[PDB]
Amino acid sequence: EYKTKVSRNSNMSKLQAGYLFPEIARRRSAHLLKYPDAQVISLGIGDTTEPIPEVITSAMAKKAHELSTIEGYSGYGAEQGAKPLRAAIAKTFYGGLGIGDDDVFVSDGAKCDISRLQVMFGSNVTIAVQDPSYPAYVDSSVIMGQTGQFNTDVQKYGNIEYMRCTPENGFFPDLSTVGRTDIIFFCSPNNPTGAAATREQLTQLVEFAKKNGSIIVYDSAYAMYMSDDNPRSIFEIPGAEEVAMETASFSKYAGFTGVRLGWTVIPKKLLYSDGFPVAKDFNRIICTCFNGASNISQAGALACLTPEGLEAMHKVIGFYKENTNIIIDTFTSLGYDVYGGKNAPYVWVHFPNQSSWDVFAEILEKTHVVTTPGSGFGPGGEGFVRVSAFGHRENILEACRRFKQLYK
Amino acid sequence: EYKTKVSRNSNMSKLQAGYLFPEIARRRSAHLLKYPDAQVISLGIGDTTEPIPEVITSAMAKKAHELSTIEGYSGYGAEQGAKPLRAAIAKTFYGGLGIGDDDVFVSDGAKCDISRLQVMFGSNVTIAVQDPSYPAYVDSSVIMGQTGQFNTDVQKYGNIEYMRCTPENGFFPDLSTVGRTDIIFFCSPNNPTGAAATREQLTQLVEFAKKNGSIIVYDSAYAMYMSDDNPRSIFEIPGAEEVAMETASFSKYAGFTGVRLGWTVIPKKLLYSDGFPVAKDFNRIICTCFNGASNISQAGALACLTPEGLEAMHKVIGFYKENTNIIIDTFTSLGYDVYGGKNAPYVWVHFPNQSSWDVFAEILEKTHVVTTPGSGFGPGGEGFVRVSAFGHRENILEACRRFKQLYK
Ligand SMILES: *Cc1c(COP(=O)(O)O)cnc(C)c1O
Numbered sequence: 001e002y003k004t005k006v007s008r009n010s011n012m013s014k015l016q017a018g019y020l021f022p023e024i025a026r027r028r029s030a031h032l033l034k035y036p037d038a039q040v041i042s043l044g045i046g047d048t049t050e051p052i053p054e055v056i057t058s059a060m061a062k063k064a065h066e067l068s069t070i071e072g073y074s075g076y077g078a079e080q081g082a083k084p085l086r087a088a089i090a091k092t093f094y095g096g097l098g099i100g101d102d103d104v105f106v107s108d109g110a111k112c113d114i115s116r117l118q119v120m121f122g123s124n125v126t127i128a129v130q131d132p133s134y135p136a137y138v139d140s141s142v143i144m145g146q147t148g149q150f151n152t153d154v155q156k157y158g159n160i161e162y163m164r165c166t167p168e169n170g171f172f173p174d175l176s177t178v179g180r181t182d183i184i185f186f187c188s189p190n191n192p193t194g195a196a197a198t199r200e201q202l203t204q205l206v207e208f209a210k211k212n213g214s215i216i217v218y219d220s221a222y223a224m225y226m227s228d229d230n231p232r233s234i235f236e237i238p239g240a241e242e243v244a245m246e247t248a249s250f251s252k253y254a255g256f257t258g259v260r261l262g263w264t265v266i267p268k269k270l271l272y273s274d275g276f277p278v279a280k281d282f283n284r285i286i287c288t289c290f291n292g293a294s295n296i297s298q299a300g301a302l303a304c305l306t307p308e309g310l311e312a313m314h315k316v317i318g319f320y321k322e323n324t325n326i327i328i329d330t331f332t333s334l335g336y337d338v339y340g341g342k343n344a345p346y347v348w349v350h351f352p353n354q355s356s357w358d359v360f361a362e363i364l365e366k367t368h369v370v371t372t373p374g375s376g377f378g379p380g381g382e383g384f385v386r387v388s389a390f391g392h393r394e395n396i397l398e399a400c401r402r403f404k405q406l407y408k
Numbered sequence: 409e410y411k412t413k414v415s416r417n418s419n420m421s422k423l424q425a426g427y428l429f430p431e432i433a434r435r436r437s438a439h440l441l442k443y444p445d446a447q448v449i450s451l452g453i454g455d456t457t458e459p460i461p462e463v464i465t466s467a468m469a470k471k472a473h474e475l476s477t478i479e480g481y482s483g484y485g486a487e488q489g490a491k492p493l494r495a496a497i498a499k500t501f502y503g504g505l506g507i508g509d510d511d512v513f514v515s516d517g518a519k520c521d522i523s524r525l526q527v528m529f530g531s532n533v534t535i536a537v538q539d540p541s542y543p544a545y546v547d548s549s550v551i552m553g554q555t556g557q558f559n560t561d562v563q564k565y566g567n568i569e570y571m572r573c574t575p576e577n578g579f580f581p582d583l584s585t586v587g588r589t590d591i592i593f594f595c596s597p598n599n600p601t602g603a604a605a606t607r608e609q610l611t612q613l614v615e616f617a618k619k620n621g622s623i624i625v626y627d628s629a630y631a632m633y634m635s636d637d638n639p640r641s642i643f644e645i646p647g648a649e650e651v652a653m654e655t656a657s658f659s660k661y662a663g664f665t666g667v668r669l670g671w672t673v674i675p676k677k678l679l680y681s682d683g684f685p686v687a688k689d690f691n692r693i694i695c696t697c698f699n700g701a702s703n704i705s706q707a708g709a710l711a712c713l714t715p716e717g718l719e720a721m722h723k724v725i726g727f728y729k730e731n732t733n734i735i736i737d738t739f740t741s742l743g744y745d746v747y748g749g750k751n752a753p754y755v756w757v758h759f760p761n762q763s764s765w766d767v768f769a770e771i772l773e774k775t776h777v778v779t780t781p782g783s784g785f786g787p788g789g790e791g792f793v794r795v796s797a798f799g800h801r802e803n804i805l806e807a808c809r810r811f812k813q814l815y816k
Pocket residue numbers: 291454516517518519520542595599627629656657658659660665669670
């Protein structure tokens with residue numbers, strides 16, 4: 001029984017358990033083993049369910065055809081992203097906010113941007129996250145050697161600042177009790193709570209980062225579901241250009257979850273403590289560690305940033321916000337406290353006194369509905385469950401009538 | 409100017425000057441500011457130039473049309489890649505070599521595979537690479553914390569074993585001179601040299617990884633260009649499954665360079681010194697730090713692994729193999745030592761008593777042909793130049809009459 005002499009990466013061993021999502025999918029592969037005929041409805045992973053609009057798919061199909069012509073054939077392409085696409089993103093999403101074409105970095109998706117940022121920052125930085133938050137920030141940090149071990153008494157990795165975002169503080173932390181770090185990851189609208197920060201809130205966030213000499217990594221993945229009058233971008237806060245970057249994705253807006261495109265914006269005025277432009281480093285990482293987003297997907301996102309493309313996406317965003325209103329109403333009618341739902345395609349449901357893993361297991365077994373337990377998302381966390389609103393209309397109506405049968 | 413309080417990642421300051429291909433791209437733009445009317449032919453960056461075979465692009469297109477239907481809409485994940493694709497890759501390139509479906513991890517390409525591997529390994533391993541070798545292994549190693557500083561005397565980074573590969577050893581390390589490392593990056597058919605390890609050399613390498621307790625990262629990106637009767641996979645060497653993983657790309661066979669599809673194979677018996685399965689850590693990385701190759705790229709890759717697919721790839725590999733014989737004929741008829749171009753789309757031309765940067769500057773200046781100086785690939789390296797065989801036939805032909813003009 002042979003073994004090499006290379007030691008496992010000790011940051012891999014720190015990881016408490018497997019990644020939240022494959023584990024949920026694991027738990028559900030198991031349920032369809034126990035019950036091969038169960039009509040399983042999945043509102044677990046925020047996985048878009050509608051076709052991509054024909055305006056996007058034609059662009060992609062035509063790009064594929066053109067690769068078989070001498071004149072349409074491209075090859076390797078700027079790994080920063082096609083220039084017309086960087087421009088279109090700058091203008092569409094950041095026009096009037098001080099961002100140029102050269103500040104946008106197109107990628108194969110935000111999960112990949114996140115880990116690209118993390119290799120760039122290195123393992124000598126400390127980080128803060130919202131609690132609860134999206135598990136890829138915490139997990140990438142452990143992986144990169146930014147942390148200590150996991151403490152099972154608090155449910156926290158050591159050396160990470162966890163910023164409690166609760167129903168009682170509007171899901172915004174009390175920044176007077178948050179310890180300085182190098183990096184602050186901020187998701188708005190938040191996954192899993194659905195909370196979108198206010199102009200005044202983000203104002204404080206910028207001031208805080210500016211006082212502590214921190215970088216904010218702002219995740220606007222969901223910002224197109226905004227209903228309230230709140231910034232969609234951090235760069236709307238004057239002074240964000242000296243302390244902030246933004247990551248986003250086409251997945252939620254265009255349904256590109258299997259299709260794969262995002263970007264990150266690093267402004268010319270984000271500098272490390274020696275004056276070295278942070279953008280200059282991310283560019284160096286992108287050239288050595290990534291090979292550029294797919295040219296078919298880039299033609300895709302290009303067609304998105306057009307009157308028709310934007311119309312198409314508004315429609316699909318409207319469909320999901322309806323599903324979410326339906327989910328909100330069902331749990332409200334059943335007597336539960338539900339947050340989120342206004343500014344994001346998922347709802348955040350309080351089950352007081354119960355473990356969220358237990359709730360998840362109950363709903364799954366009795367209803368054949370997949371949800372996501374809150375403590376998948378950090379210690380603040382327990383016992384909320386995130387219910388996602390990405391399903392066909394019939395599927396959400398039926399999941400909803402299941403939750404109705406189940407609860408009193 | 410305002411500056412944050414976070415320090416630059418010291419692994420990025422280690423790096424330097426500033427990635428080779430940008431460096432050549434500059435000198436190419438500089439050159440054209442000098443010769444505005446100049447007909448510049450690029451035999452530089454190894455980049456595919458023929459259209460993707462129709463049978464591929466049709467598959468990719470049809471996939472794109474399908475994302476706009478209820479039936480054929482997808483969504484996320486299985487970031488390991490789709491089952492049928494992993495199956496087809498296992499069967500087609502590793503049939504008979506003990507490799508299961510589950511050992512194959514589909515990625516969006518070989519540069520992103522080295523990223524993910526290097527993060528899985530962590531900052532604490534040491535690495536051996538061939539000298540000259542493809543920059544991505546070296547630069548990614550620096551980025552990850554694996555080296556010390558660059559030494560301008562010898563032109564190498566501290567803490568890397570550079571395994572020299574020269575005319576005098578027929579471009580294979582003399583392994584009894586090679587110090588132990590944790591990882592050995594090994595590319596055959598090699599880039600830049602075009603040299604493909606023999607069955608007896610690869611057996612020597614595995615036996616060396618076995619006694620040193622090392623991991624081989626075998627790079628078969630050019631394996632489909634093999635002409636000599638040499639193993640195309642490391643897994644052809646009995647015992648490789650205990651000490652080797654393999655990394656490949658569709659970029660150089662279907663011209664996927666701008667489309668983006670690769671894979672990495674990790675056998676079941678590859679373990680760390682504590683008995684832990686390397687593949688498991690890899691699966692954890694790909695799950696948390698990547699979101700999968702594109703569904704459209706996967707559909708393309710699947711169309712390749714079919715009789716028509718394979719027929720198409722052979723015809724393109726053949727086109728470029730004919731380009732490369734013409735390059736060899738011409739340098740050889742001109743008196744030089746010319747290496748590779750038998751098992752690879754690269755010729756390795758010896759220009760003794762000159763620096764490769766000057767031969768490059770000379771060729772570029774006086775013929776309007778871009779090459780790649782051998783020194784961009786490491787000290788061993790000096791002074792060859794690499795000539796790529798990817799371009800249109802007329803372009804290769806024209807560059808070749810231009811070489812004759814130029815030489816003695
Ligand atoms: C082209 C090439 C690869 C493939 O890179 P992709 O990211 O798939 O394009 C890998 N290794 C070497 C040495 C190469 O030349």
